[PDB]
Paper text:
In this work, with the use of cryo-EM, we resolved two conformations of the bullet-shaped GroEL–GroES complex at 3.4 Å. These conformations exhibit differences in the relative orientations of the apical domains of the trans ring. After additional refinement, we have solved two major classes with different orientations of the apical domains in the trans ring. In the first structure, the apical domains are located further away from the symmetry axis than in the second one, and, therefore, we denoted them as “wide” and “tight”. The estimated resolution was 4.0 Å (C1)/3.4 Å (C7) and 4.24 Å (C1)/3.4 Å (C7) for the “wide” and “tight” states, respectively. At this resolution, we can conclude with confidence that the subunits of both rings contain nucleotides in the nucleotide-binding pockets, most likely corresponding to ADP. According to this classification, here we observe the R′′/R-ADP state for both tight and wide conformations. The assessment shows almost no difference between nucleotide-binding pockets of the cis rings of the tight and wide conformations. At this level, it is not possible to find out whether one of our two structures coincided with the structure of EMD-1046. If we do not take into account the difference in the nucleotide states of the trans rings, then the wide isoform would correspond to a time-extended stage when the GroEL–ADP7–GroES complex begins to bind ATP molecules in the trans ring, but the apical domains of the trans ring have not rotated yet (i.e. between the steps depicted in Fig. 6d,e of Ranson et al.). We propose that such complexes appear under low ATP:ADP ratios, which precludes the substitution of the ADP for the ATP in the trans ring and the subsequent release of GroES from the cis ring.
Numbering used by the authors:
A (entry chain Az): 152 to 376
B (entry chain Ba), C (entry chain Bv), D (entry chain Bh): 1 to 97
E (entry chain Bu): 227 to 376
F (entry chain Al): 302 to 376
Write the structure that this text describes.
C-alpha cells in the first residue's frame, strides 16, 4: 500500500477474524476513516418480503429466537400447499423462517394475518441469485441448518413435509436488504463433507469470476466474509 | 310477507364465507371459500313435474344442507340479508350420520 | 350429523392418488393418476325419476366402485377429509367377479 | 372382485391395435387403427330406463362386438390390462352371419 | 422421452434383472427425469441419463456406432420400434460407464469385434469420399472412437 | 388494507381517525390538528428519523426530511 501502516494492520486483523477460508473485500467507504466489517455465519443479500413482519421496529428489522427454517423450490402459490406444515409448526410453537424462490399474494397476506394477530411467528425471505447456483446455495443453507431442501426433483410435496424435515438455527436476523443466520443445528462432519465437495470444484474452476463465487460459498459455510 | 319458493324450489342461508381458522389452528387470509353448507328457510309446496298427483319435497325448514354453487343457484336479500334460492336437485344433501 | 345425499345420489371416498409402485416394481414420480376406484360412504334413498313408485338405488354402503371423473362429480370435506358426491349414473361400476 | 357395470352398461376387450399385415400381405407401419372390434367381458343387469319392469340387455359375455370409439366410451385396467366400458347404445353390433 | 408411460415395461424388466442402466435419448422430459431421480435415490433401479451427441444425421450415425460398440439395438420410429415393445435382448452392454457434468465415457463394450470392424470399414470408406475436409475430420473422430483413441 | 386483511365492508367508526379541521383546494390538501396521541406520533417520528441516518440517496433523504417535518414542525 506504498508504506500505509493503517492498510497493513486492517488486513492483518481481517485475515485474523475471517480465517484462511474467509474472503476479504474492498468497497467505497462511508467516511474519511477506514472501517472493517466482519460477518460470521450465513449472510446473503435478500430482504424481508413485507414490512409487516417487523417485530423490532426500533431496530427496523425482524429477529426470531430458535426458529425452524423451511427451504422450498419454485413458487409458494397458495396457503393450500402450506397448511399441514403451518398446523404442525404452530402446534409445536416455535418461530419460523420461510425460504422459497417467491411468495404469492394469498400466501404473503395470510402469513401477515397470522403473525400480526399472534397465531404463528413467521418471517419470509427470497432465495439468493438465480439458476443452478441458487439451487446449490439452498443445499448449502440446508446443510448449515441441518434440514432438508423440499423440491419437485426429489419428489417432495410441500403438503407432505413434517417437522423432522425442517432444519433449525439458534437465531435469525433480517433487514430490508440483507438476511443473516446465527449458528446452525447442522452436524459439523456433514458441513465439512459438503465444504470438501465445494472446495474440490474450486480446483476445477475455469472461470476465475465464478471461482470467487465458489470462494464465497466456502467462506459462508466456514469462516466469515 | 317475504316472498315464497315455487314448486321444486328451496330457500337457504349460506353458513359462512371461509371457515376462517383452518384446522382449528391457522387464521386464513383471503381464500374465497364461500361455504358449501346452507340452512333451510322456506320450502315450496312439492314437485309438480309429471302431470299426476303432487309430490312433497324431501327437504324441510330447519334442515342443514349442502348445494352446488352452480348456474341455477340465485341469491337475493330477505329483509336486507342475502339468502340463496335453488331447486331441490341443485341441492346435493341434508344432515346424515 | 354429516350431510346426506338426495335421490339418485351417492357419496364415496377416492381410494388413492397414484398407485405409486407401478406393476409392483417402479416407484412412479408425478403422474397425476387420481384413482378411478372409490368406496361407498352414503346412498340417497332411491331414484324419484318418473313419477310413480320410488326405486331403491342398486349401490350400497360398503361397496367398492369405479366412477367417471366427469363434470357432474363434486368433491368436498367430510369432517376435514375430501370425499366425492355424484349420481348413480356418473358411477360406472361395483365389485364384480 | 373386479368392479361391475351398472344398468345399460357393458365391458369389453379391444381386439387389436392395427391388423398389422394389411390384406394378409403388406406389413403396415404406424397407422393408428385402434380396432373397432371388441369382445364382451361383463354385462350390467338390464336397462332401467322408463320406470316399469327391467329389460335384460341383448348382449352377453362371450360375444364379439363392434362399438363407436366415441365420447361415451371409457377405458381402464382390469388387473393391469386396459379394457373398455360403455353403454349398450355406444355398442353398434354383435357377430351376425 | 416424453413420459414414463412409454418407459414402464423396460423399467420393470431391467429392475427385475437387477443391473444398472444408462439411458441415451435426444432429450428427457420433466416427468421422466423426476421419476428416474425418485427410483435411483430410493434404490429401486440404478440409472444414469445422458443426452445424444451433436445434431441431425451425424447424431443418428454416431448413435448406430455407439450401438455397434455396446452390442445393442437402436430403438427408432423408422425401424418401427416402440419403446414399449423393447426387451432386455434389445439392449447392449458395457463393462463400465463413467459420466461428468461436461463429458460421457464408456469402457469396453459387449459388441462383437467382427461387427465393429464391418461398421469401421463402412465409415472408413466414406472418408475416401469426403469432399468436405472439415467433415472428413469428423469422420476420422468416429473411426477413432470406435477403434483406437483420441 | 388488504395486507392487514381489512375489508372496507368490515370497518367501523372506531377504525377512523379524526382531525379538528380539514381544508382542500384544486391543487393542495391540508389538515389542521390531529386526534392522534403525541407519544405515538413521536415513536413514529423516531422510526422515520432513524432511517434518515441510513439514507444513501440524498435526494430521498430530503423526502424523509419532509415526512418528519409534516408530522412535527412545518414546511
Amino acid at each position: 500500500a506504498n508504506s500505509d501502516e493503517t492498510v497493513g494492520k486492517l488486513i492483518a486483523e481481517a485475515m485474523d477474524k475471517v480465517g484462511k477460508e474467509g474472503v476479504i473485500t474492498v468497497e467505497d467507504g462511508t467516511g474519511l476513516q477506514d472501517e472493517l466489517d466482519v460477518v460470521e455465519g450465513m449472510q446473503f443479500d435478500r430482504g424481508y418480503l413485507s414490512p409487516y413482519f417487523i417485530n423490532k421496529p426500533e431496530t427496523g428489522a425482524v429477529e426470531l429466537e430458535s426458529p425452524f427454517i423451511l427451504l422450498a423450490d419454485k413458487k409458494i402459490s397458495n396457503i393450500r400447499e402450506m397448511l399441514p406444515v403451518l398446523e404442525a409448526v404452530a402446534k409445536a410453537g416455535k418461530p419460523l423462517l420461510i425460504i422459497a424462490e417467491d411468495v404469492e399474494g394469498e400466501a404473503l397476506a395470510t402469513l401477515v394475518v397470522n403473525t400480526m394477530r399472534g397465531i404463528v411467528k413467521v418471517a419470509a425471505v427470497k432465495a439468493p441469485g438465480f439458476g443452478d447456483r441458487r439451487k446449490a446455495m439452498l443445499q448449502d443453507i440446508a446443510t448449515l441448518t441441518g434440514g432438508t431442501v423440499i423440491s419437485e426433483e426429489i419428489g417432495m410435496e410441500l403438503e407432505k413435509a413434517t417437522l423432522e424435515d425442517l432444519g433449525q438455527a439458534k437465531r435469525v436476523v433480517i433487514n430490508k436488504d440483507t438476511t443473516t443466520i446465527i449458528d446452525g443445528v447442522g452436524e459439523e462432519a456433514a458441513i465439512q463433507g459438503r465444504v470438501a465437495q465445494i472446495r474440490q470444484q474450486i480446483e476445477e474452476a475455469t472461470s476465475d469470476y465464478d471461482r470467487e463465487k465458489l470462494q464465497e460459498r466456502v467462506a459462508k459455510l466456514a469462516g466469515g466474509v | 310477507m317475504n316472498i315464497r319458493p315455487l314448486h321444486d324450489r328451496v330457500i337457504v342461508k349460506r353458513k359462512e364465507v371461509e371457515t376462517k381458522s383452518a384446522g382449528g389452528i391457522v387464521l386464513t387470509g383471503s381464500a374465497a371459500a364461500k361455504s358449501t353448507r346452507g340452512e333451510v328457510l322456506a320450502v315450496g309446496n312439492g314437485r309438480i313435474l309429471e302431470n299426476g298427483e303432487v309430490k312433497p319435497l324431501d327437504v324441510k325448514v330447519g334442515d342443514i344442507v349442502i348445494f352446488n354453487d352452480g348456474y341455477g343457484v340465485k341469491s337475493e336479500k330477505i329483509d336486507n340479508e342475502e339468502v340463496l334460492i335453488m331447486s331441490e336437485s341443485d341441492i346435493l344433501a341434508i344432515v346424515e350420520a
